[PDB]
Amino acid sequence: MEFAFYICGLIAILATLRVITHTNPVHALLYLIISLLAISGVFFSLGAYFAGALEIIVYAGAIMVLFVFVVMMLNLGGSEIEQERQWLKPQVWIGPAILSAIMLVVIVYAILGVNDQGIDGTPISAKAVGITLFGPYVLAVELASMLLLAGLVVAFHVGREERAGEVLSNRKDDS
Amino acid sequence: MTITPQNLIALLPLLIVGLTVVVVMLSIAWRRNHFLNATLSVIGLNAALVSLWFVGQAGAMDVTPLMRVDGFAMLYTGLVLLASLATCTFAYPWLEGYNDNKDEFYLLVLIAALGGILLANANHLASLFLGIELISLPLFGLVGYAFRQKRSLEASIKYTILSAAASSFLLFGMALVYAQSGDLSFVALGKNLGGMLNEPLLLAGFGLMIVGLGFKLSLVPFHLWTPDVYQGAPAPVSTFLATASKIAIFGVVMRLFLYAPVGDSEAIRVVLAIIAFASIIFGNLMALSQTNIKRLLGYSSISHLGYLLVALIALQTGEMSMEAVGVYLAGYLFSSLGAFGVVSLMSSPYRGPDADSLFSYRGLFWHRPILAAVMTVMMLSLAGIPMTLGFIGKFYVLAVGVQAHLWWLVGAVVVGSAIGLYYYLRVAVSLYLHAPEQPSNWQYSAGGIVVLISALLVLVLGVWPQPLISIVRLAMPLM
Amino acid sequence: LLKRDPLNSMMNIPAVLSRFAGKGLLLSENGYLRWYVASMSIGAVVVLALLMVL
Amino acid sequence: MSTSTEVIAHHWAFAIFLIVAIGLCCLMLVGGWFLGGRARLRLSAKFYLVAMFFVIFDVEALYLFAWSTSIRESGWVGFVEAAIFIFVLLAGLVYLVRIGALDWTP
Amino acid sequence: MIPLQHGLILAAILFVLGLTGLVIRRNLLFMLIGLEIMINASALAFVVAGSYWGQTDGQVMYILAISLAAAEASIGLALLLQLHRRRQNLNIDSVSEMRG
């Protein structure tokens, strides 16, 4: 099942590469969705069934949904930036990509040299994750519940309209 | 590991802050009252303080692999609760003139206080990560609470983006150190290694963790978020993110570097030495040409965290560095508390989003002289000047640096302090000049007496620092 | 020749160098979030390179 | 695993089922295309609010997803922590009800 | 069967590409997209590290990572639509009024 892992990793790299260098954001979000699907396939190839299940249940099922909601909600089509095409120019694209490639080179130099028993089978079932998550990690789930509550409270406080109607114009500073 | 009901008494400030979070939530849902919710929040924090005393009645425990409670955790937990109490008392007059909802502020302050308590109690990588995110996200709420204002929205955007980047960097670093060593507890991060401590994977993961933590501690060159976030955010928010967030994150950083055997490495120590050197020099040089008090206090936070880092370098040699950091953190807490309290009292109420949120420290003595006296006392304390507790912390960090022969770092501290006192007593004098042009609420008086007790505390503990040293050395963690 | 003080000037060039370094270091605080993330990446690269060299 | 000669048959059946459903849909669209002959504004914030409710309660649901597998392996202490988890979850829920974020009111 | 080095290299590549998209792109929505890419790469690295040692702590860290990703992605999208409702542009270099 290592061939499936290699194919999923290669198409995940290609999908996120097309995410970085795309013009309109809807196809970028679609490529990120298939990248999350490939990452879930990687998760299934390594015995992390619950991780890939949560990847397409939540990461590819709730987060990208929220991004598509906002994109189709405020009617952005990438306009007034897609006529510039500033990221398809050497003076903007060469520098940070060189810096990130230097980061990649040094971090994969750090990756090599470590001993490797290798990825084995014996997939980690969700039952063991449930035992550990409600075992030594009681405070983890309670404080993550409070973290999600705090995020809900903040984004309700910030991202509420306080106006009326299901159609609103982009008026400057909401009158 | 299961939780015994003897371990229930050790979780008491955490559980009471969570219970007052949900009680404040149901009180907002029922009535939507400002004064009642603020009273419930401060009552919950005071009950957390007395239950921290009840924790002190019990011993030092290790509840889960996530959490260990001792005097280290007790001391920085109490600092977090008192900073949150100060934030609430400063924020009530600021929220009195607020148009939108005015209780989610208290809910987020309580949640971020709970995250700071977790960070003080954190003995795990998961607990560290969860605590820094529980500090970050209510800070996203507090900084962008006045989202109608342009500068608060800009500061919230910058803080959210850079903290998400730092959280991802730290998460990748802990992923690398978990790939190297097959455990996530602090004490087991280097147990498998043994002259082979400098593993490249573990070192790279701890470097990424250093990036993600030195963002929060405003260490260079992850320091550029600091003045924008200090300026844009509301003044009680600036108070909270100056005292409590940095105190909790530096406490969990020190517990990480103390329990893990990777602190004996001669590469992480040198990198932190370079970072502290450049942080002290850059922050003190970059607050020099500043006319806004909040930007200047952000750069001052950068310089004081550089002082904290040089105190942290000699952790494995001097054996007094934890005591020095406790004393210095108490002094910095009370000094920043008083200064940002004067800032919040003068910037209260909110007065709408179109109004200018400029402090205008010049001529402050001629209408409110007590606040000017408190502010110049805080400027004396932050400058490493005697009769103040900041000088006691400065003496402690100088002793820590000179005990382990950190001569470059000691010279950096001396040069940075000599640079710093320029703008420190420049502000302290400029608040006594004559301004060209230019209150009786009981909670405004409560904030005034809060900064008054802060000034009395820093003056007394500058002229008599023995009780603070006695209660810091009594709170000695497991070694 | 000493109606203006030379030794005062030669002891004031620490202040001149401090002011020049401050003026050159405030150029980094340009207020752009993109440069802030770029400096974050630069610092991560510097930390990783210093840890790999040492 | 690829050696137990029955679960590998189930894996082959699952993969072939997926690829032949995708191929059936592709060939149906191909048959639709080939045969037949030729001849500013903004929506709201309440949609964002309900989608954020979905994702936040979805993560607070995945915690119960993990709990429900080990509901009998864990003891009554697991029931207590899940009970206070559901209690603070319902506290946030009733907060959203009583404030008014959860209603539409056209 | 599979070396740990290949999975960690994949995670590092995804994190580096997410950082590249975070830096080179002015659109704040694309910056949040790159942030989610970096969080996904860190979570993938934690999952690979957990699966190498045969422990379920990596999946617990993955759960915490995706909880943070959900909450702060909601944070960033709420701030994004607030930015759109106030200044009517999603450009991130335009919101630079606060300078040193």
UniProtKB/Swiss-Prot annotation, chain E:
GO CC terms, sorted: NADH dehydrogenase complex; plasma membrane
InterPro entries: NADH_UbQ_OxRdtase_chain4L/K, NUOK/Mnh_C1-like
Ranges in a coiled coil: none
Location(s), subcellular: Cell inner membrane
Main location group: membrane
Keywords: Cell inner membrane, Cell membrane, Membrane, NAD, Quinone, Translocase, Transmembrane, Transmembrane helix, Transport, Ubiquinone
GO biological process, one term: ATP synthesis coupled electron transport
Transmembrane segments: 4-24, 28-48, 60-80
Top-level enzyme category: translocase
Reaction it catalyzes: a quinone + NADH + 5 H(+)(in) = a quinol + NAD(+) + 4 H(+)(out)
Gene3D superfamilies: 1.10.287.3510
Bilayer disposition of the protein: Multi-pass membrane protein
This protein's record includes keyword Cell membrane: yes
Gene Ontology molecular function, alphabetical: NADH:ubiquinone reductase (non-electrogenic) activity; quinone binding
One Pfam family of this chain: Oxidored_q2
EC number(s) from the headed UniProt entry: 7.1.1.-
Subunit structure: NDH-1 is composed of 13 different subunits. Subunits NuoA, H, J, K, L, M, N constitute the membrane sector of the complex.
Family of this protein: Belongs to the complex I subunit 4L family.
Function: NDH-1 shuttles electrons from NADH, via FMN and iron-sulfur (Fe-S) centers, to quinones in the respiratory chain. The immediate electron acceptor for the enzyme in this species is believed to be ubiquinone. Couples the redox reaction to proton translocation (for every two electrons transferred, four hydrogen ions are translocated across the cytoplasmic membrane), and thus conserves the redox energy in a proton gradient.
Protein name: NADH-quinone oxidoreductase subunit K
Protein source organism: Escherichia coli (strain B / BL21-DE3)
Native organism taxonomy: Bacteria, Pseudomonadati, Pseudomonadota, Gammaproteobacteria, Enterobacterales
